[PDB]
Amino acid sequence: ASPFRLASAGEISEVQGILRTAGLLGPEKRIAYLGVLDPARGAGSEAEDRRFRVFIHDVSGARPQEVTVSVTNGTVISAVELDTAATGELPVLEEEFEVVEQLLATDERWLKALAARNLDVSKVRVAPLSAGVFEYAEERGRRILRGLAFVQDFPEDSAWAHPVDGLVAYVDVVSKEVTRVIDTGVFPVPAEHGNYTDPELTGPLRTTQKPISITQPEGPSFTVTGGNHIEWEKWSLDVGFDVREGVVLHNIAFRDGDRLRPIINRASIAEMVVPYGDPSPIRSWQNYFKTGEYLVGQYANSLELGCDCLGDITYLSPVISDAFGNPREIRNGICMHEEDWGILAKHSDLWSGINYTRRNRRMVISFFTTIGNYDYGFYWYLYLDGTIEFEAKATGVVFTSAFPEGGSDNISQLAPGLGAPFHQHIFSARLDMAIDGFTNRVEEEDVVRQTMGPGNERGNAFSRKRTVLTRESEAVREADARTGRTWIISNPESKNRLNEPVGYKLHAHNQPTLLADPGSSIARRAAFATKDLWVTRYADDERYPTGDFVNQHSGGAGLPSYIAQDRDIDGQDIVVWHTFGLTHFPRVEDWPIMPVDTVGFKLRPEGFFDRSPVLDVPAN
Amino acid sequence: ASPFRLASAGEISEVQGILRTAGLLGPEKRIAYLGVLDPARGAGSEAEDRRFRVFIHDVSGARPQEVTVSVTNGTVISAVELDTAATGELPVLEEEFEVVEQLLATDERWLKALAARNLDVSKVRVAPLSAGVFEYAEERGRRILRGLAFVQDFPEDSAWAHPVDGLVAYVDVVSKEVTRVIDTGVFPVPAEHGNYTDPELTGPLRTTQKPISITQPEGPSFTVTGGNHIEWEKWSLDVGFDVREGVVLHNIAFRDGDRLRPIINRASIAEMVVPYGDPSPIRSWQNYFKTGEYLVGQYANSLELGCDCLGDITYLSPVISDAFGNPREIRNGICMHEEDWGILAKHSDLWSGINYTRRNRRMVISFFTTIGNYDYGFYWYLYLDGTIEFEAKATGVVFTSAFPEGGSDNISQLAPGLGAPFHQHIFSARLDMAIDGFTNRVEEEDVVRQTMGPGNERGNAFSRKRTVLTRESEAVREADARTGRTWIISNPESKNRLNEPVGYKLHAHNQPTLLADPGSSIARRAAFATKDLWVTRYADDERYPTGDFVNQHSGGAGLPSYIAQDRDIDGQDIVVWHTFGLTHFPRVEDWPIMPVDTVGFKLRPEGFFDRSPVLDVPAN
Ligand SMILES: [Cu+2]
Ligand SMILES: [Cu+2]
């Protein structure tokens, strides 16, 4: 009976029924987004009322709507018509991506471009990409997708090995018309194939790898109740799933002695943008907002035991809605398991004669998603010592282009004539903090060097300083690896036995942030990506760092708008938004299929406990 | 057979015999250091000539000597008398450490200080620490150790919980004289115990941890031949061990098709310093050069199966010399095993319909050492994809002091009246590079942001630049996390199929470097720690960033002196010295025994291969 339980197939069917009966789901309507709403602040009087938020698109050109329904009472709470030219277009529908290639196939301009290159239209695949907002005034209020071509020689061929450069088209997916076809010139289409399962490319497979058996004879140490409530080594939390954000962690708490202490109320990856840095007009508009425009949860893979998740695995099979309101289960879309994590603590003391060693372990909650050529893994980790960590694993096939004769300052060569445009993968982790409760504050901590002189005669001293972020106007921070900068979230009203506010310290990897020019469209639409840490006052309607309707929005939505309210964040209900990502200059080793690369962050207790919280761990 | 084989008990006994025969090892002599020398460059010597280098101390006060012997020919190659006041004292002898507490127990000044604090001398343990170089003229040319007191209430009590602040003594361990006893005032001695095995403190042990079984039914995938030659998933290398550096990796190479391609000739942690940042006269001289002053290898722990190393483990038991030249085995001092490392590569392609997933693995070579209250683990990893990584794991018990009543800017409070002075753990990895051979060069690579305008009208473009370090004077570099700075080691004479020099990219964690004032004794003695990367031209006698004799040695040797030669490093036999470490502001969670914290670095192939090197990994 938990308010955080996963949505059932029936609940989705109920939403569909409610919408249909209300006359909001006619033949031309499509569900672009559907997700359950989290309980509002308080809920003292559990008025069990499951509500769902829905974005309804209209393939007839009619205005879309944002609808909130109660499946508990079978009613429509609200239905507001949207003006997309102002607030943004709805997420792209899976069915719209498909129309791009089909439409271009009958367009004379597109056919002429292919004919000049001697490419069989039946062999040309088109990657349907988001459009963004640039200089095309005629696109305002219109639902546009831009297409890039790749040649697939046969059904099992990897089209990514054969990009068709110098060609790009724009399509209005509603009116179903090709608005523009741009041909800047012919580029040779890379000839080598990139079929990583072809013996001629892989060569003889290795026979040197001996098996590694990972098993748990007595089962896992974690328990799963209520379908998604996890309890493991003092940790307590609920594993949620949203079609937009994917796996979402709720009510992360730690059992300290006789009481369950909250740490984080809600943790999620609220946005993930992939901006490309190739100035060619063929791709200079390319920016993927995987979470906001595509909805990462929708493309979560069904994970295979022994392949994707090894060991004693417990799966969750979340249900999402299709474009018509029908429930669709993502079988084994979420993996949950614990794993050994080496030494936790060790000391061999000469004086006491006591030799002490203890092993560490971590709870893993993950899912993997595939969008076009991209495949990303999202992993959340909980450690015995109270550490919380997130890790993104990037793999898949690199997005390609032709490699210009004479070289390039924005593209790397992967194979003869095959290029890989430079780009970044930037994430935003939204952490609704709850350190021992909702009264929290954030301090920026920097190492402080000291000068040799009075009070420091030997010049060996060093210290640190903490600065409280009191208002949102001063809560947009940047990293400073040189000074070991971190951010501490504490509760000024909850102190440890040493009379110090309890807290958790966020450790960033300090990777580069958004590189685009400050005046670019992407810098405006993905402003969150330009700074490492943002702190806002909690608000029900502030869910994503990029706003609710990211697709083709002019910019400034999300964090920049929230921060502008300049609210008090010193000892209040606050939310931390951490930006982190990878800057990718593709290497030859990333082709034909990319070995995993990673990025993330972690938070460690900082005076949260009265002493080490793992003294009760037994000897293994 | 192999000139890179581990030293045998017989070789050590032979060195002892050769030294004795030469009249260099009488009863007053002690072996402060003994290690096998790596073979010289080029196939000079026909067969293999095994040579050992020894530092010989004299307990009567006579000048020590540095000697090189040929165990093969039974001859002394060179023997030079050392002027320690100039070039440095020899490493501390394990036998000198116990001298301190013993001598102080009968010193009137020390006894009076203890009586003023109402402490029973029989219960006062003394931590004998390296002295460094400061303003004490009488210490020049003498072997000094400085002692700090801790109370041990009973046999199995953790003395670290009871520091005796305001007191420190200096001792000449050769003449066995207490040179000075400094008492700055009585501080309350923390009363709470820190016994982590006491149920009173641990509380009932957890019974919630279910077993995790990791086994290999068909045995490990790596082979060990010649006692220390490893072959694993295309990797080839020799695992060496030196009493000073600990585990050293030799001839790291990768089998690419029909060629064994070298990558790194020698990899080791050439120095490790732990500088303290508390300006109190009681500890302002505290700087542990664990590698250079103590010799970390001799303190390597015997690792227990199922506790320290889990899974199918293969052990090496290196042999070192004791103070008299007798061989001593460190049973199971080195652990070797392979472990699963999640997903290696994955992609589910819509167009081809092919779903591909491969798992990763890594080879682990490690050892753990204990020096006083510190316990550090050194781990080297080799990955299927060609990545090489190092990781240091810090644990043990934090060094304590009293926590001043009025607070402190250089000490954190762990318990009532118990403090933990701020400090750093800084390592120097010496990487004698051999990317496809010895003709190498290093380039510093920075991300390059571009301004919106002609050629970049949308302001989305970004690039990078590479600067070749051509001479040693230009090869002392600092990190720049903000610009994603990395360093690439390439071979300008060996190109991949795309006509680009093959290389490897070094990725640093970009943690803060040495914080001490540049004019401090420690900034001069640990000069290498003030910069992130140094590149030198290979030289037989340039082994450590701090020189051969670190104990009580001022600046003048090491990296700063090597770089002065300003040698050509553009396409030559070069060595990369990477500084990396942790800055520790102790938390309450670090008490009474510290949970592991880590730091390290890694190198990934950068155009070294012609495509991904893991296409031949099976699905299994
Ligand atoms: Cu990428
Ligand atoms: Cu430390």
UniProtKB/Swiss-Prot annotation, chains A, B:
Gene3D superfamilies: 3.10.450.40, Copper amine oxidase, catalytic domain. PROSITE patterns: COPPER_AMINE_OXID_1, COPPER_AMINE_OXID_2. One of its GO terms (molecular function) is primary methylamine oxidase activity. Its EC number is 1.4.3.21. Coiled coil: none annotated. It comes from the Bacteria. Its cofactor is Cu cation; L-topaquinone. It holds the Pfam family Cu_amine_oxid. Substrate binds at residues 288-299, 371-376. The modification 2',4',5'-topaquinone is found at residue 374. InterPro entries: AGAO-like_N2, Cu_Am_Ox_Cu-bd, Cu_Am_ox_TPQ-bd, Cu_amine_oxidase, Cu_amine_oxidase_C, Cu_amine_oxidase_C_sf, Cu_amine_oxidase_N-reg. Induction: By phenethylamine. Keywords: Copper, Disulfide bond, Metal-binding, Oxidoreductase, TPQ. Topaquinone (TPQ) is generated by copper-dependent autoxidation of a specific tyrosyl residue. Homodimer. This is Phenylethylamine oxidase.
